[PDB]
Design a protein around this ligand. Structure first.
Ligand code: CL
Ligand code: CL
Lengths: 256, 256
């Protein structure tokens, strides 16, 4: 079967991270949309204009709003992208055939929206040469960050080629997790986000979303299906692109 | 010898085009700077804010201004990047060891600055699915363009992999040649731009800067050295990356 995949990058990244996977999915006959989120990739906004993870998700919400009735998509989120999935599913949960989490946060409906991010920061407290700043938006102080190049090299793109790592150095931008805003956000709903089918894809060789964290997430909120990819690194859509495509084909064949 | 290479993308592109060449040059021991020009790549400006090729070149001029006395660079420009070189050399010609033109326009000092662009449009008049718009800045109507995806595929990235072409679809942005502004611009000077060493690199398999054009440019304004790369396509920094690095090493060893 063919699906319409909507690929959703993590914070400080852009659609460009999916530059290998997108053509491969298309070569399998799928429609693929790879979005830049607010203040990401070639989006014209700067992060200091963005006050929440919800506002950050605008391009995804807008895209879903523009789907004609009856058209469903499979959302694929990497790393912090699982939060954008949760947000989208609580607005457009009739449009979502399934969501695939790709070394991603997996929010739940029983704890506050910041819950898995708070846990991530316990398990991986040291972001190496990553720099931080503060800005104010909508009366709240928000912590912005710029991922450090050594963190990028060693922990996110560990096994990626120099030309891929170079793209990350060139294209990664200031971003934010909006952790304090998430902490005060209404919980994700059981009827929207809770109802969607959730496929959890991971590698135990991920050097930032470490096994303790990913296995903790799986036990905390049981996915409908789990796929464990052998080897690779955190950016499986670069290091294990063919394997990710294979998994996504199976998802397309399973959930509609 | 080692040099400091400053790599300069064409219109509608960004530093990202150099993502393969930059690490290779670095693996030879060079310092490499790959800039986003105004309203290009991750630069925060939109093109409608930019009134001239000179204003477009600001990030390059600013970068050159920030070089401490005595430090010289080798400028490397692709496609329309030769115009940014001319502009820079007329402000900072003591800072420039040489300029390498990479399937690039080669402005001169005898004809108006638009001369080689006017000629390019004669030789390659049909930009396929490229779209055009007009905006007004500083009292002048400027023609903006968005390179068409079929033009990209067939003429710029002809022999590049699908994953490279995908980057171009994701990252290329609205731009302008500022052709009418160039036409009224003061000529490039003999003392600045005219004095710099100029190395002309090309392939006769380029499907946009066709042989008639490139050979016309070489005869119009004799380069100090010409290198012809066999095969590849217009984006030689993607299809012939190792060959471009080899040439640039030789340039570094020749001109300081
Ligand atoms: Cl609920
Ligand atoms: Cl002169």
């Amino acid at each position: 079967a063919f699906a319409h995949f909507v690929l959703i990058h993590t914070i400080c990244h852009g659609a460009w991270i999916w530059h290998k996977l997108k053509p491969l999915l298309e070569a399998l006959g799928h429609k693929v949309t790879a979005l830049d989120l607010a203040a990401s990739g070639v989006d014209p906004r700067q992060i200091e204009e963005i006050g929440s993870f919800d506002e950050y998700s605008e391009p995804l919400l807008t895209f879903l709003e523009a789907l004609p009735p009856g058209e469903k998509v499979i959302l694929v989120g990497e790393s912090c992208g699982g939060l954008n999935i949760a947000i989208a599913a609580d607005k457009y949960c009739e449009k979502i055939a399934a969501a695939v989490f790709h070394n991603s946060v997996l929010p739940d409906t029983e704890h506050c929206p910041s819950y898995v991010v708070d846990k991530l920061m316990e398990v991986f407290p040291d972001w190496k040469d990553t720099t931080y700043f503060t800005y104010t938006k909508d009366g709240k102080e928000i912590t912005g960050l710029k991922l450090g190049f050594t963190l990028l090299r060693e922990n996110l793109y560990t096994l990626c080629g120099p030309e891929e790592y170079e793209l990350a150095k060139m294209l990664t931008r200031k971003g934010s997790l909006f952790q304090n805003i998430l902490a005060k956000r209404p919980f994700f709903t059981k009827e929207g986000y809770g109802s969607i089918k959730k496929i959890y894809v991971w590698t135990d060789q991920d050097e930032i979303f470490l096994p303790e964290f990913q296995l903790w997430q799986i036990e905390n909120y049981k996915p409908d299906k789990v796929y464990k990819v052998e080897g690779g690194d955190h950016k499986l859509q670069l290091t294990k692109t063919k394997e990710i495509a294979e998994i996504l084909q199976e998802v397309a064949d399973t959930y509609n």
